[PDB]
Chains A and B, each alone.
Chain A
Amino acid sequence: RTFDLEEKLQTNKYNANFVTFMEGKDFNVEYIQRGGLRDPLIFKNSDGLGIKMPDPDFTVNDVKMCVGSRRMVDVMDVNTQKGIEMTMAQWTRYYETPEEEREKLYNVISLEFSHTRLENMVQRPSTVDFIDWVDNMWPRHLKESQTESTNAILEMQYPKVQKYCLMSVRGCYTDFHVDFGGTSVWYHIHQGGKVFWLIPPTAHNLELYENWLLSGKQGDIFLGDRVSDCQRIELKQGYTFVIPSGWIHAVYTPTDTLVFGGNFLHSFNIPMQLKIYSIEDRTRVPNKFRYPFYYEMCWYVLERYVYCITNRSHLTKDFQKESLSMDME
């Protein structure tokens, strides 16, 4: 990295105001229908959101005991933004190491803990449940059949992207990116704090982003300097943040932090979701870093809209029968 992160954290220049500060009770389906979930949102308190979180003093070791000591986790090397892998016990050892003894800065942003004990300790905002394509569009008998708690693709029965635990040490930095498939993101600061820089997905900015990706100079060019308006904003302990489809963001961690969050597609900004998918295609993003079963899901969305509106099914007889059995439960 050749830019100075500390000047990016200190400057007053990222002074756009893109974020809407909301109350949880107002974050409902009617709000989504009216606004298209186009605006990033901050909930300074959880009242009215319908979230559930672990004990306030939950630790990384607690996460490890819920997911398993031997669970392989993807870890980011902050200096290179490259991925490595280790077990959750090894990750916990790292995390518990005093700061002045850690040889390198590593970050975990990708531990998906669905189908472990941890899963029932964390609930996302109720309203996300009413609109996530996984919950509302994917054949339910397939989702319910998932047993594997890792993100091994051969065992994956639906897009396993709903619930992640992020564990970040002071000094961590995740460089600018758009979440896979143009997914929207919810993000809850259980403990600690985060700094985000937000860049809106205008056609121009998305062109810049793609060209930056294709240049390979991500360590040299701080993308928030290349655009007309960027917002840097701090999330404090207990805040919930929702990031809309397409939004280009980077994140810095000023104190050891534990976050619960996750990703979702939805029906109100499909064009952006498709745009982002096509950027991933052109920039040759490896499958492993993409939304699993993306076009499969899109076919299921079409079928659900036609069925729900017209009562005509385009699922197989067997699939219809599986669905009817569940309707009778």
Chain B
Amino acid sequence: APATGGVKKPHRY
């Protein structure tokens, strides 16, 4: 549950 940043992912369908 710590917040993250710099996660690589396109948008969901």
**A residues touching B (Cβ–Cβ < 8 Å)?**
1, 74, 76, 80-83, 109-110, 112, 150-156, 159-161, 164, 174-177, 179-180, 213, 216, 218-219, 263, 283, 285, 287-292
Contacts and interface: CB of A to CB of B under 8 A. Distances in A.
Contacts of B3: 152-154, 287-288
28 contacts: A74-B8, A74-B9, A80-B12, A81-B12, A82-B12, A83-B9, A83-B12, A110-B9, A112-B6, A151-B4, A151-B7, A153-B4, A160-B5, A160-B6, A161-B6, A164-B8, A177-B10, A180-B6, A218-B12, A218-B13, A263-B6, A263-B8, A283-B11, A287-B3, A287-B5, A288-B3, A288-B5, A292-B5
A153 B5 contact: yes
A175 B9 contact: no
A83 B6 contact: no
Contacts of A110: 6-9
Contacts of B8: 74, 109-110, 164, 179-180, 263, 289
A83 B8 CA distance: 10
Contacts of A159: 6
Contacts of A154: 2-3
A81 B8 CA distance: 12
A83 B7 CA distance: 10
A219 B13 CA distance: 6
Contacts of A81: 9-13
A290 B8 CA distance: 8
Q: In the complex, which of the residues B3, B7, B8, B11 has the most CB atoms of chain A within 10 Å of its own CB atom?
A: B8
A287 B3 CA distance: 9
Nearest to A110: B8
Given A81-B11, A83-B7, A110-B9, 6 more contacts: A76-B9, A110-B8, A150-B4, A151-B6, A155-B2, A292-B6
Contact of A288 (B7, B10, B11, B13): B7
B12 A289 contact: no
The 7 A-B pairs at the shortest CB distance, nearest first, are namely: A177-B10, A219-B13, A292-B5, A110-B8, A152-B2, A153-B5, A161-B6
Contacts of A290: 5-6
Nearest to B12: A82
A151 B13 contact: no
B6 A1 contact: no
B13 to A, nearest CB: 4
A177 B4 CA distance: 20
A176 B11 CA distance: 9
Nearest to A155: B2
Nearest to B3: A153
B10 A152 contact: no
Contacts of A283: 11
Nearest to A75: B9
Contact of A74 (B2, B4, B12): B4
A109 B9 contact: yes
A152 B6 CA distance: 9
A74 B7 contact: yes
